[PDB]
Amino acid sequence: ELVEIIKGIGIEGAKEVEEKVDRQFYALQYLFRHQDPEMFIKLVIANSLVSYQLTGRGEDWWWEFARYFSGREVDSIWKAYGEFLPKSKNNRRLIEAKLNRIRKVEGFLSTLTLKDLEGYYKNMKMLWKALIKIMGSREDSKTIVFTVKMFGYASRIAFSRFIPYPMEIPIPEDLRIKSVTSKLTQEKPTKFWMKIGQESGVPPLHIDSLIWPLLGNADLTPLDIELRNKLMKLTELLG
Template sequence: MTLDRFIRVRYRADEEKVEALREILSELGLDCARTIEERVDLQFDALRNLHGNLKNDELFIKLVIANSIVSYQLSAKGEAWWWEFSRYFSGNPPEGSIVGAYSAFLPNSKTNRRLTAGKLRRLERLEPFLDSLSLEDLRNYYFNGMELLRNELAKTLGSRKSAKTIVFAVKMFGYAGRIVFGKFVPYPMGIEIPDDVRINAYTKRFTNEPPVSFWRGIAEETGIPPLHIDSILWPVLGGHDEVLTRLKKYCTKWKEVLRLANL
Protein backbone atom coordinates (compact mmCIF):
# COMPACT_ATOMS: atom_id res chain seq x y z
CA MET A 1 0.00 0.00 0.00
CA THR A 2 1.43 3.37 -0.98
CA LEU A 3 1.33 6.67 0.86
CA ASP A 4 -0.15 8.53 -2.10
CA ARG A 5 -3.51 7.00 -1.23
CA PHE A 6 -3.46 9.11 1.94
CA ILE A 7 -1.32 12.11 0.98
CA ARG A 8 -2.48 14.41 -1.80
CA VAL A 9 0.56 15.00 -3.97
CA ARG A 10 0.90 18.52 -5.35
CA TYR A 11 2.13 18.57 -8.92
CA ARG A 12 3.50 21.49 -10.87
CA ALA A 13 1.23 22.81 -13.61
CA ASP A 14 1.18 25.68 -16.10
CA GLU A 15 -2.22 26.96 -15.02
CA GLU A 16 -2.58 29.30 -17.99
CA LYS A 17 -2.07 26.45 -20.43
CA VAL A 18 -4.31 24.11 -18.45
CA GLU A 19 -7.11 26.68 -18.45
CA ALA A 20 -6.74 27.16 -22.22
CA LEU A 21 -6.91 23.37 -22.63
CA ARG A 22 -10.11 23.20 -20.58
CA GLU A 23 -11.70 26.02 -22.57
CA ILE A 24 -10.90 24.49 -25.96
CA LEU A 25 -12.09 21.01 -24.99
CA SER A 26 -15.28 22.41 -23.44
CA GLU A 27 -15.95 24.29 -26.67
CA LEU A 28 -15.36 21.18 -28.78
CA GLY A 29 -17.46 18.85 -26.63
CA LEU A 30 -18.52 15.25 -27.12
CA ASP A 31 -20.03 15.89 -30.56
CA CYS A 32 -16.63 16.89 -31.94
CA ALA A 33 -15.05 13.74 -30.50
CA ARG A 34 -17.72 11.59 -32.12
CA THR A 35 -17.23 13.32 -35.49
CA ILE A 36 -13.49 12.67 -35.35
CA GLU A 37 -14.03 9.04 -34.38
CA GLU A 38 -16.61 8.24 -37.05
CA ARG A 39 -15.63 10.53 -39.93
CA VAL A 40 -11.91 11.22 -39.50
CA ASP A 41 -10.38 8.13 -37.87
CA LEU A 42 -9.23 5.74 -40.59
CA GLN A 43 -9.48 2.86 -38.10
CA PHE A 44 -13.27 3.34 -37.97
CA ASP A 45 -13.36 3.05 -41.77
CA ALA A 46 -11.31 -0.15 -41.56
CA LEU A 47 -13.85 -1.64 -39.16
CA ARG A 48 -16.78 -0.64 -41.35
CA ASN A 49 -15.07 -2.34 -44.28
CA LEU A 50 -14.53 -5.57 -42.33
CA HIS A 51 -18.07 -5.58 -40.97
CA GLY A 52 -19.53 -5.18 -44.45
CA ASN A 53 -17.46 -8.05 -45.80
CA LEU A 54 -17.61 -10.46 -42.86
CA LYS A 55 -21.41 -10.40 -42.43
CA ASN A 56 -21.14 -11.95 -38.96
CA ASP A 57 -21.73 -9.48 -36.13
CA GLU A 58 -20.53 -11.68 -33.29
CA LEU A 59 -17.33 -12.74 -35.02
CA PHE A 60 -16.69 -9.16 -36.12
CA ILE A 61 -16.79 -7.78 -32.58
CA LYS A 62 -14.65 -10.61 -31.22
CA LEU A 63 -12.04 -10.06 -33.92
CA VAL A 64 -11.93 -6.35 -33.09
CA ILE A 65 -11.30 -7.10 -29.41
CA ALA A 66 -8.65 -9.69 -30.29
CA ASN A 67 -6.91 -7.35 -32.70
CA SER A 68 -6.83 -4.57 -30.11
CA ILE A 69 -5.08 -6.85 -27.63
CA VAL A 70 -2.19 -7.38 -30.06
CA SER A 71 -2.02 -3.76 -31.26
CA TYR A 72 1.33 -2.82 -29.75
CA GLN A 73 4.95 -2.66 -30.94
CA LEU A 74 3.66 -2.08 -34.46
CA SER A 75 5.89 -1.86 -37.53
CA ALA A 76 3.81 0.97 -39.03
CA LYS A 77 1.16 3.52 -38.05
CA GLY A 78 -1.93 2.15 -36.36
CA GLU A 79 -4.16 3.12 -39.27
CA ALA A 80 -2.10 0.97 -41.65
CA TRP A 81 -2.24 -1.96 -39.23
CA TRP A 82 -6.01 -1.80 -38.84
CA TRP A 83 -6.50 -1.63 -42.59
CA GLU A 84 -4.21 -4.64 -43.05
CA PHE A 85 -6.31 -6.46 -40.43
CA SER A 86 -9.54 -5.43 -42.18
CA ARG A 87 -8.43 -6.55 -45.62
CA TYR A 88 -6.92 -9.81 -44.41
CA PHE A 89 -9.94 -11.03 -42.46
CA SER A 90 -12.35 -9.76 -45.13
CA GLY A 91 -10.74 -12.30 -47.44
CA ASN A 92 -9.78 -14.90 -44.83
CA PRO A 93 -12.50 -15.14 -42.19
CA PRO A 94 -11.50 -17.49 -39.35
CA GLU A 95 -12.85 -21.00 -39.93
CA GLY A 96 -11.62 -22.33 -36.58
CA SER A 97 -10.08 -20.56 -33.63
CA ILE A 98 -9.04 -16.91 -33.59
CA VAL A 99 -5.63 -17.98 -32.31
CA GLY A 100 -5.26 -20.29 -35.29
CA ALA A 101 -6.23 -17.50 -37.66
CA TYR A 102 -3.67 -15.14 -36.13
CA SER A 103 -1.01 -17.85 -36.23
CA ALA A 104 -1.29 -17.59 -40.01
CA PHE A 105 -1.79 -13.81 -40.12
CA LEU A 106 0.78 -12.28 -37.76
CA PRO A 107 4.00 -13.95 -38.99
CA ASN A 108 3.32 -12.58 -42.48
CA SER A 109 2.00 -9.17 -41.41
CA LYS A 110 3.67 -6.11 -42.91
CA THR A 111 2.61 -3.77 -40.09
CA ASN A 112 2.66 -5.94 -36.93
CA ARG A 113 5.51 -8.41 -37.12
CA ARG A 114 7.29 -7.83 -33.79
CA LEU A 115 6.94 -10.04 -30.70
CA THR A 116 4.65 -12.44 -32.55
CA ALA A 117 5.01 -15.31 -30.06
CA GLY A 118 4.02 -13.10 -27.12
CA LYS A 119 1.03 -11.73 -28.98
CA LEU A 120 -0.20 -15.23 -29.83
CA ARG A 121 0.11 -16.19 -26.15
CA ARG A 122 -2.09 -13.23 -25.25
CA LEU A 123 -4.70 -14.43 -27.72
CA GLU A 124 -4.53 -17.93 -26.24
CA ARG A 125 -5.44 -16.47 -22.85
CA LEU A 126 -8.15 -14.27 -24.35
CA GLU A 127 -9.94 -16.74 -26.61
CA PRO A 128 -11.75 -18.80 -23.92
CA PHE A 129 -13.30 -15.56 -22.63
CA LEU A 130 -14.36 -14.53 -26.13
CA ASP A 131 -15.76 -18.01 -26.80
CA SER A 132 -17.98 -17.68 -23.73
CA LEU A 133 -19.72 -14.58 -25.11
CA SER A 134 -22.85 -14.50 -27.23
CA LEU A 135 -23.90 -11.54 -29.37
CA GLU A 136 -26.40 -10.66 -26.63
CA ASP A 137 -23.58 -10.61 -24.07
CA LEU A 138 -21.65 -8.26 -26.33
CA ARG A 139 -24.73 -6.07 -26.72
CA ASN A 140 -25.06 -5.85 -22.93
CA TYR A 141 -21.41 -4.88 -22.57
CA TYR A 142 -21.90 -2.15 -25.17
CA PHE A 143 -25.05 -0.60 -23.76
CA ASN A 144 -24.57 -1.22 -20.05
CA GLY A 145 -21.13 -2.53 -19.19
CA MET A 146 -18.05 -1.18 -20.94
CA GLU A 147 -16.30 -0.83 -17.58
CA LEU A 148 -17.21 -4.43 -16.76
CA LEU A 149 -15.72 -5.52 -20.09
CA ARG A 150 -12.56 -3.60 -19.23
CA ASN A 151 -12.38 -5.40 -15.90
CA GLU A 152 -12.91 -8.83 -17.46
CA LEU A 153 -10.26 -8.22 -20.11
CA ALA A 154 -7.75 -7.09 -17.49
CA LYS A 155 -8.51 -10.12 -15.31
CA THR A 156 -8.27 -12.53 -18.24
CA LEU A 157 -4.92 -11.16 -19.40
CA GLY A 158 -3.46 -10.48 -15.96
CA SER A 159 -3.10 -6.78 -16.79
CA ARG A 160 -3.82 -3.53 -14.99
CA LYS A 161 -7.25 -2.06 -15.73
CA SER A 162 -5.50 1.07 -16.99
CA ALA A 163 -3.06 -0.85 -19.24
CA LYS A 164 -2.83 0.71 -22.68
CA THR A 165 -4.02 -2.31 -24.68
CA ILE A 166 -6.90 -2.93 -22.25
CA VAL A 167 -8.38 0.56 -22.51
CA PHE A 168 -7.65 0.63 -26.25
CA ALA A 169 -9.57 -2.64 -26.63
CA VAL A 170 -12.59 -1.00 -24.99
CA LYS A 171 -12.27 1.98 -27.32
CA MET A 172 -12.24 -0.22 -30.41
CA PHE A 173 -15.05 -2.35 -28.96
CA GLY A 174 -17.03 0.89 -28.74
CA TYR A 175 -16.39 1.54 -32.42
CA ALA A 176 -17.51 -2.00 -33.29
CA GLY A 177 -20.60 -1.65 -31.09
CA ARG A 178 -21.69 1.50 -32.89
CA ILE A 179 -21.31 -0.23 -36.24
CA VAL A 180 -23.19 -3.39 -35.21
CA PHE A 181 -25.89 -1.98 -32.93
CA GLY A 182 -26.43 1.32 -34.74
CA LYS A 183 -26.42 3.58 -31.70
CA PHE A 184 -23.78 5.85 -30.18
CA VAL A 185 -23.00 5.11 -26.53
CA PRO A 186 -20.40 7.41 -24.93
CA TYR A 187 -17.45 5.80 -23.21
CA PRO A 188 -17.70 5.77 -19.41
CA MET A 189 -15.85 8.42 -17.40
CA GLY A 190 -14.21 5.62 -15.42
CA ILE A 191 -12.14 4.26 -18.32
CA GLU A 192 -8.75 5.96 -18.51
CA ILE A 193 -6.97 7.54 -21.45
CA PRO A 194 -4.36 5.24 -23.06
CA ASP A 195 -1.03 6.11 -21.42
CA ASP A 196 1.14 5.96 -24.52
CA VAL A 197 4.20 7.88 -25.69
CA ARG A 198 2.28 10.63 -27.48
CA ILE A 199 -0.09 11.31 -24.57
CA ASN A 200 2.83 11.22 -22.14
CA ALA A 201 4.79 13.81 -24.11
CA TYR A 202 1.75 16.08 -24.60
CA THR A 203 0.85 15.94 -20.92
CA LYS A 204 4.31 17.25 -20.01
CA ARG A 205 3.43 20.53 -21.74
CA PHE A 206 0.95 21.17 -18.94
CA THR A 207 2.10 19.36 -15.81
CA ASN A 208 4.35 16.77 -14.22
CA GLU A 209 1.27 14.92 -12.97
CA PRO A 210 0.91 11.33 -14.28
CA PRO A 211 -1.09 11.43 -17.54
CA VAL A 212 -3.89 9.11 -16.45
CA SER A 213 -4.80 11.18 -13.38
CA PHE A 214 -4.31 14.52 -15.16
CA TRP A 215 -6.67 13.62 -17.99
CA ARG A 216 -9.15 12.08 -15.57
CA GLY A 217 -9.39 15.51 -13.94
CA ILE A 218 -9.71 17.29 -17.28
CA ALA A 219 -12.46 14.84 -18.26
CA GLU A 220 -14.44 15.59 -15.12
CA GLU A 221 -14.05 19.34 -15.61
CA THR A 222 -15.07 19.34 -19.28
CA GLY A 223 -17.64 16.55 -19.23
CA ILE A 224 -15.79 14.65 -21.97
CA PRO A 225 -14.79 11.06 -21.05
CA PRO A 226 -11.04 10.32 -21.28
CA LEU A 227 -11.33 7.97 -24.28
CA HIS A 228 -13.15 10.69 -26.21
CA ILE A 229 -10.49 13.25 -25.23
CA ASP A 230 -7.97 10.81 -26.68
CA SER A 231 -9.87 10.96 -29.98
CA ILE A 232 -9.78 14.77 -30.06
CA LEU A 233 -6.05 14.82 -29.36
CA TRP A 234 -5.25 12.12 -31.91
CA PRO A 235 -5.19 14.32 -35.09
CA VAL A 236 -3.07 16.86 -33.20
CA LEU A 237 -0.47 14.35 -32.02
CA GLY A 238 0.68 12.81 -35.25
CA GLY A 239 -2.20 12.67 -37.69
CA HIS A 240 -0.85 12.46 -41.25
CA ASP A 241 -1.99 14.53 -44.22
CA GLU A 242 -5.08 12.44 -45.00
CA VAL A 243 -6.24 12.72 -41.39
CA LEU A 244 -5.85 16.50 -41.38
CA THR A 245 -7.67 16.75 -44.72
CA ARG A 246 -10.57 14.71 -43.33
CA LEU A 247 -10.58 16.75 -40.13
CA LYS A 248 -11.00 19.98 -42.10
CA LYS A 249 -13.68 18.39 -44.30
CA TYR A 250 -15.88 16.85 -41.62
CA CYS A 251 -15.26 18.78 -38.39
CA THR A 252 -16.66 22.32 -38.36
CA LYS A 253 -14.49 23.14 -35.34
CA TRP A 254 -11.24 21.94 -36.89
CA LYS A 255 -9.45 25.21 -36.18
CA GLU A 256 -10.15 24.78 -32.47
CA VAL A 257 -8.87 21.20 -32.63
CA LEU A 258 -5.61 22.35 -34.19
CA ARG A 259 -5.22 25.07 -31.55
CA LEU A 260 -4.49 22.23 -29.15
CA ALA A 261 -1.23 21.60 -31.01
CA ASN A 262 0.05 25.04 -30.05
CA LEU A 263 -0.55 24.86 -26.31
Protein backbone atom coordinates in the same frame (compact mmCIF):
# COMPACT_ATOMS: atom_id res chain seq x y z
CA GLU B 1 -8.36 26.83 -20.83
CA LEU B 2 -7.50 23.44 -22.29
CA VAL B 3 -10.53 22.42 -20.23
CA GLU B 4 -12.65 25.05 -21.99
CA ILE B 5 -11.70 24.08 -25.54
CA ILE B 6 -12.41 20.42 -24.78
CA LYS B 7 -15.72 21.13 -23.06
CA GLY B 8 -16.66 23.23 -26.09
CA ILE B 9 -15.83 20.41 -28.49
CA GLY B 10 -17.75 18.07 -26.21
CA ILE B 11 -18.60 14.40 -26.65
CA GLU B 12 -20.33 15.26 -29.90
CA GLY B 13 -17.17 16.88 -31.18
CA ALA B 14 -15.18 13.74 -30.39
CA LYS B 15 -17.94 11.63 -31.93
CA GLU B 16 -17.58 13.49 -35.20
CA VAL B 17 -13.78 13.11 -35.36
CA GLU B 18 -14.17 9.39 -34.66
CA GLU B 19 -16.78 8.85 -37.35
CA LYS B 20 -15.32 11.11 -40.10
CA VAL B 21 -11.61 11.50 -39.47
CA ASP B 22 -10.34 8.53 -37.40
CA ARG B 23 -8.65 6.10 -39.81
CA GLN B 24 -9.03 3.17 -37.40
CA PHE B 25 -12.83 3.69 -37.27
CA TYR B 26 -12.86 3.72 -41.08
CA ALA B 27 -10.75 0.51 -41.16
CA LEU B 28 -13.44 -1.05 -38.90
CA GLN B 29 -16.38 0.04 -41.12
CA TYR B 30 -14.55 -1.60 -44.02
CA LEU B 31 -14.12 -4.93 -42.23
CA PHE B 32 -17.65 -4.95 -40.79
CA ARG B 33 -19.38 -5.16 -44.15
CA HIS B 34 -17.18 -8.13 -45.06
CA GLN B 35 -17.51 -10.15 -41.86
CA ASP B 36 -20.02 -11.82 -39.59
CA PRO B 37 -21.02 -9.22 -36.91
CA GLU B 38 -20.16 -11.44 -33.94
CA MET B 39 -16.77 -12.47 -35.30
CA PHE B 40 -16.14 -8.84 -36.38
CA ILE B 41 -16.43 -7.57 -32.83
CA LYS B 42 -14.42 -10.46 -31.39
CA LEU B 43 -11.65 -9.93 -33.95
CA VAL B 44 -11.43 -6.21 -33.06
CA ILE B 45 -11.09 -7.19 -29.42
CA ALA B 46 -8.39 -9.74 -30.18
CA ASN B 47 -6.58 -7.34 -32.54
CA SER B 48 -6.53 -4.54 -29.97
CA LEU B 49 -4.90 -6.72 -27.31
CA VAL B 50 -1.90 -7.34 -29.57
CA SER B 51 -1.63 -3.81 -30.97
CA TYR B 52 1.51 -2.87 -29.09
CA GLN B 53 5.19 -2.72 -30.15
CA LEU B 54 4.09 -2.65 -33.81
CA THR B 55 6.46 -3.08 -36.75
CA GLY B 56 4.51 -0.42 -38.67
CA ARG B 57 2.23 2.64 -38.38
CA GLY B 58 -0.89 2.13 -36.26
CA GLU B 59 -3.16 3.22 -39.08
CA ASP B 60 -1.48 0.85 -41.54
CA TRP B 61 -1.75 -2.00 -39.06
CA TRP B 62 -5.49 -1.58 -38.68
CA TRP B 63 -6.04 -1.41 -42.46
CA GLU B 64 -3.87 -4.52 -42.92
CA PHE B 65 -6.04 -6.19 -40.28
CA ALA B 66 -9.18 -4.91 -42.01
CA ARG B 67 -8.25 -6.24 -45.43
CA TYR B 68 -6.85 -9.54 -44.17
CA PHE B 69 -10.07 -10.56 -42.41
CA SER B 70 -12.42 -9.10 -45.01
CA GLY B 71 -13.86 -12.15 -46.78
CA ARG B 72 -12.19 -14.61 -44.39
CA GLU B 73 -14.30 -17.21 -42.62
CA VAL B 74 -12.73 -17.60 -39.21
CA ASP B 75 -13.03 -20.79 -37.17
CA SER B 76 -10.36 -20.17 -34.53
CA ILE B 77 -9.23 -16.58 -33.87
CA TRP B 78 -6.10 -17.96 -32.24
CA LYS B 79 -5.34 -20.02 -35.35
CA ALA B 80 -6.23 -17.14 -37.66
CA TYR B 81 -3.63 -15.02 -35.84
CA GLY B 82 -1.04 -17.83 -35.86
CA GLU B 83 -1.18 -17.58 -39.62
CA PHE B 84 -1.72 -13.79 -39.66
CA LEU B 85 0.94 -12.21 -37.38
CA PRO B 86 4.03 -14.04 -38.75
CA LYS B 87 3.00 -13.05 -42.32
CA SER B 88 2.13 -9.49 -41.35
CA LYS B 89 3.84 -6.32 -42.37
CA ASN B 90 2.94 -4.13 -39.43
CA ASN B 91 2.84 -6.46 -36.43
CA ARG B 92 5.73 -8.87 -36.77
CA ARG B 93 7.28 -8.72 -33.31
CA LEU B 94 6.82 -10.45 -29.93
CA ILE B 95 4.71 -12.99 -31.76
CA GLU B 96 4.98 -15.66 -29.06
CA ALA B 97 3.55 -13.33 -26.37
CA LYS B 98 0.85 -11.93 -28.64
CA LEU B 99 -0.45 -15.35 -29.78
CA ASN B 100 -0.57 -16.41 -26.14
CA ARG B 101 -2.54 -13.27 -25.37
CA ILE B 102 -4.90 -14.21 -28.19
CA ARG B 103 -5.14 -17.81 -26.94
CA LYS B 104 -6.03 -16.35 -23.57
CA VAL B 105 -8.76 -13.87 -24.61
CA GLU B 106 -10.23 -16.35 -27.08
CA GLY B 107 -11.43 -18.72 -24.35
CA PHE B 108 -13.45 -15.77 -23.07
CA LEU B 109 -14.70 -14.59 -26.46
CA SER B 110 -15.72 -18.09 -27.45
CA THR B 111 -18.29 -18.15 -24.64
CA LEU B 112 -19.97 -14.88 -25.70
CA THR B 113 -22.99 -14.36 -27.97
CA LEU B 114 -23.75 -11.29 -30.05
CA LYS B 115 -26.28 -10.42 -27.37
CA ASP B 116 -23.61 -10.72 -24.66
CA LEU B 117 -21.33 -8.40 -26.65
CA GLU B 118 -24.20 -5.94 -26.90
CA GLY B 119 -24.78 -6.10 -23.14
CA TYR B 120 -21.09 -5.34 -22.63
CA TYR B 121 -21.47 -2.36 -24.96
CA LYS B 122 -24.26 -1.06 -22.71
CA ASN B 123 -21.91 -1.78 -19.81
CA MET B 124 -18.42 -0.87 -20.99
CA LYS B 125 -17.04 -0.57 -17.46
CA MET B 126 -17.91 -4.26 -17.09
CA LEU B 127 -16.08 -5.24 -20.26
CA TRP B 128 -13.17 -3.20 -18.92
CA LYS B 129 -13.09 -5.01 -15.59
CA ALA B 130 -13.64 -8.41 -17.24
CA LEU B 131 -10.61 -7.94 -19.51
CA ILE B 132 -8.47 -6.79 -16.61
CA LYS B 133 -9.21 -10.17 -14.99
CA ILE B 134 -8.97 -12.53 -17.95
CA MET B 135 -5.74 -10.82 -19.12
CA GLY B 136 -4.27 -10.25 -15.66
CA SER B 137 -3.54 -6.60 -16.42
CA ARG B 138 -3.37 -3.23 -14.65
CA GLU B 139 -6.56 -1.11 -14.70
CA ASP B 140 -4.72 1.62 -16.55
CA SER B 141 -2.94 -0.66 -19.04
CA LYS B 142 -2.74 1.23 -22.35
CA THR B 143 -3.56 -1.93 -24.27
CA ILE B 144 -6.55 -2.74 -22.06
CA VAL B 145 -8.22 0.66 -22.42
CA PHE B 146 -7.43 0.84 -26.16
CA THR B 147 -9.28 -2.48 -26.43
CA VAL B 148 -12.30 -0.98 -24.72
CA LYS B 149 -12.08 2.00 -27.08
CA MET B 150 -11.89 -0.12 -30.24
CA PHE B 151 -14.63 -2.34 -28.81
CA GLY B 152 -16.69 0.83 -28.63
CA TYR B 153 -16.03 1.59 -32.32
CA ALA B 154 -16.87 -1.96 -33.35
CA SER B 155 -20.09 -2.01 -31.31
CA ARG B 156 -21.03 1.49 -32.48
CA ILE B 157 -20.81 0.17 -36.03
CA ALA B 158 -22.42 -3.23 -35.51
CA PHE B 159 -25.36 -2.17 -33.37
CA SER B 160 -25.91 1.21 -35.11
CA ARG B 161 -25.96 3.03 -31.78
CA PHE B 162 -23.76 5.65 -30.08
CA ILE B 163 -22.91 5.11 -26.41
CA PRO B 164 -20.23 7.45 -25.02
CA TYR B 165 -17.24 5.96 -23.17
CA PRO B 166 -17.46 5.87 -19.37
CA MET B 167 -15.82 8.78 -17.60
CA GLU B 168 -13.89 6.30 -15.44
CA ILE B 169 -11.79 4.63 -18.18
CA PRO B 170 -8.33 6.29 -18.46
CA ILE B 171 -6.73 7.47 -21.69
CA PRO B 172 -4.47 4.97 -23.52
CA GLU B 173 -1.02 6.12 -22.46
CA ASP B 174 1.05 5.33 -25.56
CA LEU B 175 4.13 7.29 -26.64
CA ARG B 176 2.19 9.96 -28.57
CA ILE B 177 0.02 10.62 -25.52
CA LYS B 178 3.10 10.62 -23.30
CA SER B 179 4.61 13.11 -25.76
CA VAL B 180 1.79 15.68 -25.81
CA THR B 181 1.39 15.49 -22.04
CA SER B 182 5.07 16.39 -21.67
CA LYS B 183 4.63 19.97 -22.85
CA LEU B 184 1.69 20.52 -20.45
CA THR B 185 2.38 18.88 -17.09
CA GLN B 186 4.55 16.45 -15.16
CA GLU B 187 1.72 14.34 -13.75
CA LYS B 188 0.99 10.90 -15.24
CA PRO B 189 -1.13 11.26 -18.39
CA THR B 190 -3.62 8.67 -17.10
CA LYS B 191 -4.11 10.83 -13.99
CA PHE B 192 -4.01 14.20 -15.80
CA TRP B 193 -6.55 13.48 -18.52
CA MET B 194 -8.89 12.01 -15.95
CA LYS B 195 -8.94 15.45 -14.31
CA ILE B 196 -9.36 17.25 -17.64
CA GLY B 197 -12.07 14.73 -18.42
CA GLN B 198 -13.95 15.24 -15.15
CA GLU B 199 -14.09 19.03 -15.54
CA SER B 200 -14.80 19.25 -19.27
CA GLY B 201 -17.47 16.55 -19.22
CA VAL B 202 -15.57 14.64 -21.92
CA PRO B 203 -14.54 11.03 -21.09
CA PRO B 204 -10.79 10.50 -21.55
CA LEU B 205 -11.30 7.86 -24.25
CA HIS B 206 -13.09 10.57 -26.23
CA ILE B 207 -10.38 13.11 -25.41
CA ASP B 208 -7.94 10.65 -26.92
CA SER B 209 -9.80 10.93 -30.23
CA LEU B 210 -9.09 14.69 -30.10
CA ILE B 211 -5.34 14.58 -29.35
CA TRP B 212 -4.12 11.80 -31.65
CA PRO B 213 -5.22 13.39 -34.96
CA LEU B 214 -3.82 16.88 -34.20
CA LEU B 215 -0.56 15.09 -34.71
CA GLY B 216 0.04 14.05 -38.30
CA ASN B 217 -1.60 17.12 -39.87
CA ALA B 218 -4.50 14.88 -40.81
CA ASP B 219 -7.78 15.44 -42.64
CA LEU B 220 -10.29 17.87 -41.08
CA THR B 221 -12.53 18.52 -44.04
CA PRO B 222 -15.65 16.39 -43.72
CA LEU B 223 -16.05 18.21 -40.38
CA ASP B 224 -17.98 21.41 -39.62
CA ILE B 225 -16.03 24.67 -39.79
CA GLU B 226 -16.76 25.53 -36.15
CA LEU B 227 -15.49 22.13 -34.99
CA ARG B 228 -12.42 22.62 -37.17
CA ASN B 229 -11.64 26.03 -35.63
CA LYS B 230 -12.09 24.51 -32.18
CA LEU B 231 -9.74 21.75 -33.29
CA MET B 232 -7.34 24.39 -34.61
CA LYS B 233 -7.39 26.20 -31.25
CA LEU B 234 -6.58 23.01 -29.33
CA THR B 235 -3.58 22.29 -31.58
CA GLU B 236 -2.31 25.69 -30.51
CA LEU B 237 -2.66 24.98 -26.80
CA LEU B 238 -0.93 21.61 -27.16
CA GLY B 239 1.96 23.09 -29.13
